[PDB]
């Protein structure tokens, strides 16, 4: 039961985040002023991993240097990190064949695509995986699922419909739908090969994807055998079910507690608001995992680190977090918003539902509403922003600037409006 090895799929969902991932990697980005990898690594440590694998190619040098600085290069760590260097931008199937050629996989291994924060104990999962593996010989991989927010009417990027067994919890079908955003398709065709073998069919769309996998030694051999499979969910799971090898089974695990994979900006925003709230009972800012963290819980869901500087007669809101070495001026309203470490803030600034990362200076008399700011970027005076307005790295927005809804700004000095240099396309400037 002991000795467990894990593989992490990084360099996987890049450019899915549109304005960012230009200079620095996908997973380096902070959720709550702390990198996304750190959450995943904490999940690995709580699960009980002895050997860690990472997949880096694009911006791989910055990843390797971050692991060098990490808390896991030090000898006392329960796991050791070894990085896989591959050709630039490839599918998951191509990496699976590369790892099988190298041959390090022993018994039961772990694969996670993207970075997932969950409070769900993994010890229960391992036991039920092992209990079901002892039931029949030809059994492959395990999938995680969690209950959605009653109706997934706001969730459009993940329209995955799952058909599941009531008795054995085996997945039957996977389907994507454009439905509410693009009213074009309605039909879903299902294979009638498994009708009387299951009997208790349960069709659900009210389940959130996790893309966390417990996998057997069979998996890398199947990937090399069938090199046509590029994906791991859309084509692969469906391919396994539809009589590729007869008598082979795959798991689907239902859990009542919170487990959401990061993929899009507006999903990231909801997860962040869930973290500011007490949705993830263990995963809270006050516990401090990065060791340098010195966050303290205050009533009405207000988070403050050590060395927080604030001007007198200033009102703070609900579900807010402020980093260390941070200065704030007078007449400021901070409501449902995260501000990073070492961030200097001017005066008369109204913030609602917005986002600011580390080391950011904001000019006086500015209103920011439901809009994101990246690290080492400065805002000028008289800046008004709307919903879903993501601002890139090192972006210096000058004095007197108004931007409407969904006005994304590039992080590299290509095709979209507004760049990195002074007066960003309000008067032609930019490389």
């Amino acid at each position: 039961e002991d000795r467990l090895q894990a593989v992490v799929l990084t360099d996987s969902y890049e450019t899915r985040f549109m304005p960012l991932t230009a200079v620095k990697p996908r997973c380096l980005l902070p959720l709550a002023n702390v990198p996304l990898i750190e959450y995943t690594l904490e999940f690995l440590a709580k699960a009980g991993v002895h050997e860690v694998f990472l997949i880096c190619s694009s911006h791989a040098n910055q990843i390797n240097d971050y692991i060098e600085n990490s808390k896991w290069n030090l000898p006392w760590s329960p796991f050791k990190i070894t990085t896989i260097m591959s050709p630039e931008a490839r599918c998951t199937g191509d990496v699976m064949r590369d790892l099988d050629n190298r041959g390090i996989i022993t018994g039961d291994f772990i694969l996670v695509s993207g970075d997932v924060l969950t409070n769900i104990d993994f010890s229960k999962m391992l036991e039920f995986h092992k209990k079901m593996h002892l039931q029949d010989k030809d059994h492959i991989s395990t999938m995680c699922l969690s209950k959605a927010s009653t109706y997934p009417k706001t969730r459009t990027i993940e329209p995955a419909a799952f058909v599941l067994d009531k008795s054995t919890s085996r997945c039957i079908y996977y389907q994507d739908l454009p439905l509410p955003s693009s009213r074009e398709k309605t039909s879903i065709q299902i294979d009638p090969e498994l009708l009387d073998n299951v009997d208790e069919f349960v069709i659900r769309n009210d389940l959130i994807d996790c893309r966390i996998d417990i996998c057997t030694s069979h998996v890398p051999l199947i990937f090399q055998e069938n090199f046509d499979y590029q994906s791991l969910r859309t084509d692969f799971v469906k391919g396994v079910i539809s009589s590729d090898i007869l008598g082979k089974h795959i798991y689907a695990y239902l859990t009542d507690e919170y487990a959401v994979r990061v993929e899009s900006w507006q999903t990231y925003d909801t997860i962040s608001q869930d973290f500011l709230g007490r949705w993830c009972y263990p995963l809270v800012l006050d516990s401090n995992i990065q060791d340098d963290q010195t966050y303290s819980y205050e009533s009405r869901h207000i988070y403050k680190e050590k060395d927080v500087v604030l001007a007198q007669s200033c009102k703070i809101g609900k579900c807010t977090a402020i980093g260390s070495g941070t200065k704030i001026g007078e007449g400021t309203k901070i409501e449902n918003s995260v501000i990073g470490r070492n961030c200097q803030i001017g005066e008369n600034i109204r913030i609602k539902n917005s986002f600011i990362w580390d080391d950011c200076i904001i000019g006086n008399n500015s209103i920011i509403d439901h809009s994101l700011i990246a690290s080492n970027a400065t805002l000028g005076s008289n800046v008004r922003l709307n919903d879903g307005c993501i601002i890139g790295f090192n972006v210096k927005i000058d004095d007197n600037m108004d931007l409407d809804r969904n006005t994304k700004i590039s992080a590299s000095p290509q095709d979209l409006d507004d760049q990195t240099l002074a007066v960003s396309i309000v008067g032609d400037k930019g490389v």
Binding site: G277, I289, H301
Partner: protein
């Protein structure tokens, strides 16, 4: 000082750090036991030869341990306890190496008058005595406590979580001469499961069990004889941090009805730290357990807290292994076990 020197020799530092942060370790009694075994491993394995360099290193280790987990007061106290046991034997040792030292009593006033051996063995035995003290507290409580409660008296109890208090209650019910009715507040968001196990163990022993919702506390306070607290941590001013939910209001309800308040605790549970603000010391809960569905949770900003604080204005007795003391005296019991310097680690 970092854990770079203590890594290959001492591994169990980081496993306890892991047990605190993810809350794998549970109950102050257990946290204390682990830190005892940590300090057991620290003395048995290390090589020092010097004494003052050793003590200041222990101080830094304790400082890092409390910064790793703020609600682990039992962690902080146990180290502070051994620190003082060390410091007395060093001050006794320095008097023999140099060569009235007995004015009247064992006072304070460190602002007035100025100033190879088996010391390590004493340090070893000092840990052993602490364990045995934590092992047996109930014997020291029952001789003071089961003298204060009468027949036909109704007992209301917040915090059913304490193993200490339940076992105190069972020893009194063992006495066939003593009869009492037990009211138990539920403590909905956290204590519920523990409160239900509490009600089960009272029925198991055949004691008149009464389960109370947290709303109904007022609706009974006229009929209540006494109030008992299952505290986690006791402080300088007298006040307590208790094992979660629905205590503060009950104590406020008792004081308005002038109903007596009792507290059952240990000296290791007792802390030399001062609660200047409840805002920092109290730990908050998970709102997930209250309300389902996340799209309404955008607008439903729910507030829930685990640990509950009581100000000293309410409770009257702290029955320990030593005896019963008033909140206006408990500071002296603390200073009898921990030194003034051994606070700010």
């Amino acid at each position: 000082h970092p854990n770079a020197a203590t890594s290959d020799v001492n591994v169990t530092i980081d496993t306890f750090v892991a047990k605190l942060k993810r809350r794998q370790v549970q109950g102050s009694y257990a946290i204390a036991l682990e830190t005892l075994q940590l300090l057991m491993r620290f003395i048995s394995a290390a090589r020092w030869n010097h004494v003052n360099d050793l003590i200041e290193q222990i101080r830094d280790l304790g400082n890092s341990l409390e910064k790793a987990h703020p609600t682990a007061f039992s962690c902080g106290n146990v180290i502070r306890r051994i620190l003082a046991v060390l410091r007395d034997e060093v001050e006794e040792d320095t008097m023999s190496t140099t060569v009235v030292a007995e004015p009247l009593i064992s006072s304070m006033f460190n602002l007035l008058q100025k100033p190879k051996t088996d010391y390590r063995q004493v340090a070893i035995q000092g840990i052993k005595d602490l364990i045995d003290e934590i092992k047996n507290i109930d014997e020291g409580i029952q001789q003071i406590a089961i003298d204060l409660i009468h027949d036909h008296e109704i007992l209301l109890t917040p915090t059913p979580d304490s193993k200490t208090v339940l076992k105190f209650l069972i020893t009194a019910r063992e006495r066939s001469n003593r009869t009492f009715t037990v009211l138990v507040t539920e403590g909905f968001p956290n204590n519920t499961k523990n409160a239900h196990e509490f009600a089960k163990k009272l029925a198991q022993h055949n004691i008149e069990t009464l389960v109370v919702p947290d709303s109904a506390v007022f609706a009974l306070m006229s009929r209540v004889g006494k109030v008992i607290i299952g505290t986690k941590a006791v402080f300088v001013n007298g006040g307590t941090i208790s094992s979660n939910s629905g205590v503060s209001s009950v104590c406020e309800c008792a004081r308005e009805f002038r109903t007596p308040v009792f507290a059952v605790a240990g000296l290791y549970k007792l802390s030399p730290l001062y609660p200047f603000d409840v805002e920092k010391f109290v730990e908050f809960g998970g709102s997930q357990r209250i309300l389902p569905r996340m799209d309404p949770r955008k607008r439903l900003d729910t507030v829930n807290q685990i640990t509950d604080y009581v100000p000293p204005e309410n409770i009257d007795i702290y029955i320990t292994n030593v005896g019963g003391f008033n909140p206006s005296f408990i500071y002296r019991i603390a200073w009898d076990n921990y030194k003034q310097i051994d606070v700010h680690l």
